[PDB]
Amino acid sequence: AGPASGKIRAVIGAVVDVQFEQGELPAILNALTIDQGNNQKLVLEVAQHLGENAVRAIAMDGTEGLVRGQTVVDTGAPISVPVGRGTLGRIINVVGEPIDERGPIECKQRNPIHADP
Amino acid sequence: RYEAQVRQHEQEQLASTVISKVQSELQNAKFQDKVLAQAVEEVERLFAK
Amino acid sequence: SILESKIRGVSDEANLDETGRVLSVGDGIARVFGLNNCQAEELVEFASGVKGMALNLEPGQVGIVLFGSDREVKEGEIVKRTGKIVDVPIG
Amino acid sequence: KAAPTEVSSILESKIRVSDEANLDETGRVLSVGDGIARVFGLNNCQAEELVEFASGVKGMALNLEPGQVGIVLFGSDREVKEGEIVKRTGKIVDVPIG
Amino acid sequence: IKPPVQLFGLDGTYATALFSASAKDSSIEKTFQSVQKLSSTISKDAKVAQVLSNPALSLNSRKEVVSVLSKELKLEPVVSNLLTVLAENNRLSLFDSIAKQFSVLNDAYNGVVEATVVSAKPLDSKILNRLTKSITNSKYVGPGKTLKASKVNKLNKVLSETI
């Protein structure tokens, strides 16, 4: 699979600038995955694009531990969350993961958080 | 006041006629002004050397 | 010679008179690079279908305010000029 | 109207051969003052990591740029000058407990 | 090695940084003719200047791929390293400022200037400017000098203001 891999160039606070390739850059309001040291991931939403094959992304968690040049894969769509009857009774987070220690949310579909009114 | 105004008007009118004659003489290709302008530049640079 | 270097790069003519390339997009703004014949407060059109209004005509780029969402525009998109000003229907 | 990072001193090293010494685990202090210390380099340094200078003062890299790295000193900046070696400890800002 | 010529400090530091490494083993005379060929084939040509104002490219025709834009032109020594630093730092739009600063260094340590009036001066290459300006002013005043000014306009304005 052709995943849009990006390189971290700047990191000051919650804002993290990711540098990708020419033409394979992600759009706005797109979730960007990042492999850390634990079993979880680092979700990052693309806010704007500074140019020169680089876009400024906003991290949805702790930015401590990110070095210059780490791999930043793109999910292709926005922040997907679990919908339906499976989300009732469970404690969901901002990225759509369970925080109630009751297993994973068995959802058949996953809609994005960014949608038109 | 009338004597001072007549003297100031005569000096201002005489200065305007002398300024117009100096500008018309330089536009008539003065050969003496061109030779004197080149010799003044060489004498000023040699005094500061 | 400079004539042989243009055909090796595959750039065609690259006429920046009625078209322009987007260099930076975000917060409802689009810094389109080009469009030398674009007038002030003129309507524009992006490659995804979102319209724009060029109100900040600079020398290197041209600041156009998009009338839609910023998710449809990206870095390197083509921006065409409508040729008219911001008008509306009446009657 | 211009930009930082590569400027005069940092713009004359990439034209020949900028290698030899490693610039990932260590870094050179380009500018320091009023607690802040702009270290040029440290590519392998993570965010909010403990940095150790050559004079003995500790540092915390909180602002990571593309050409420089803004580190905040935890002590006095009277012993840190331009061109000092700033080594990385490899860990984050930790403290003792128990 | 830094020569006393100042030349700004931020924009003029591009040519001054590369002049230190190019002043070894006699490599300063070949850099003058190689810098003029890069600006004459990107200005009065309207062919290779398609990426001079656009912010696209991003390593497509500026660096790496060159061949005819470096080997076939006039670059083989240290002339190829000057164009690679301007492509990564986005400095290819001001190619005329980097080439103009390189010629001013050779005219200061091996020449002179100080234009008096009318046209240009003589620009000698002797030693001091004291004995060189006195021997060149007398030979240039007689030969030529059409005189088609500055000292005559300042004296006429001072006499009219005191009227």
User: Which residues 12-41 in chain C show a CB within 8 A of chain E?
Assistant: 14, 16, 21, 23, 33-34
Q: How far out from the chain centre does Cα E33 lie?
A: 12
Whole-angstrom Cα Rg for chain E: 22
Decide if C14 and E69 are in contact by the 8 Å CB cutoff: no
The count of CB pairs under 8 A between chains B and E is 43
CB contact under 8 A, A64 and D64: no
* Token pair 């991931």: residue: A41
Alpha-carbon gap: C21 to the closest alpha carbon of chain E (Å): 8
Cβ contacts (< 8 Å) between E85 and chain D: which residues?
Answer: 6, 11, 14-15
Q: For residue D16, which of E94, E22, E89 has the smallest C-alpha distance?
A: E22
Contact yes or no for C22/C31 (Cβ under 8 A) = yes
Ranges of beta strands (E only) in A13-108 are: 15-19, 31-33, 44-48, 54-59, 71-74, 80-82
DSSP summary character for residue C1:
-
CA separation for the pair A70, A9 (Å, rounded): 9
- Nearest CA-CA distance, residue D31 and chain A, Å: 18
Resolution reading in Å: 7.8
Residue A100 region by backbone torsions, left for phi larger than 0, else alpha for psi between -120 and 50, else beta: alpha
Q: CB-side exposure of E152: number of CA atoms within 13 Å?
A: 17
Task: Sort out which chain D residues have CB atoms less than 8 A from E78's CB and list them.
Answer: 15
Please indicate whether chains A and D are in contact, defined as at least 3 beta carbon pairs under 8 Å: yes
Cβ distance C76 to E56 less than 8 Å, yes or no, reads yes
Written as six digits, the tokens of E81 are 């390293």
Indicate contact of A with E: 3+ CB pairs under 8 A: yes
The minimal CB distance from C71 to the residues A22, A28, A56 is found for A28
Neighboring chain E residues of C8 at a CB cutoff of 8 Å: 61, 67-68
3-state DSSP call for residue B25? helix
DSSP 3-state assignment of D29?
strand
Give the DSSP H/E element, type plus range, for residue A58.
strand A54-59
- The answer to whether C23 contacts chain A (CB < 8 Å) is yes
Cβ-Cβ contacts under 8 Å, E114 against chain B? none
Residues of chain E neighbouring B45 (CB-CB closer than 8 A): 116, 133-134, 137
Chain C interface includes E41 (CB < 8 A): yes
Question: Computed from CA positions of residues E20, E22, E26, E32, in that sequence, does the dihedral angle turn out positive or negative?
Answer: negative
Neighbour-count burial for B26-45, b at 16+ CB within 10 Å, e otherwise: eeeeeeeeeeebbeebbeeb
Contact (Cβ atoms closer than 8 angstroms) between residue A36 and residue A42 = yes
Do A51 and E55 count as a contact with CB atoms less than 8 A apart? yes
CB C43 within 8 A of CB C88: no
Q: How many beta carbons lie within 10 A of that of residue E139, not counting itself? A: 10
Instruction: Give CA separation, C17 vs B22, C23, D97, in Å.
Output: 55, 17, 67
The residue of chain A nearest to residue E54, with distances taken between CA atoms, is: A52
Half-sphere exposure of C88 (CA within 13 A, CB side): 1
Query: Among D74, D90, D75, D84, which residue's Cα sits nearest to residue D24?
Result: D90
Q: Is D46 on the interface with A (CB under 8 A)?
A: yes
Query: Which stretches does DSSP call E strand in D3-78?
Result: 26-33, 36-41, 49-53, 58-64, 69-73
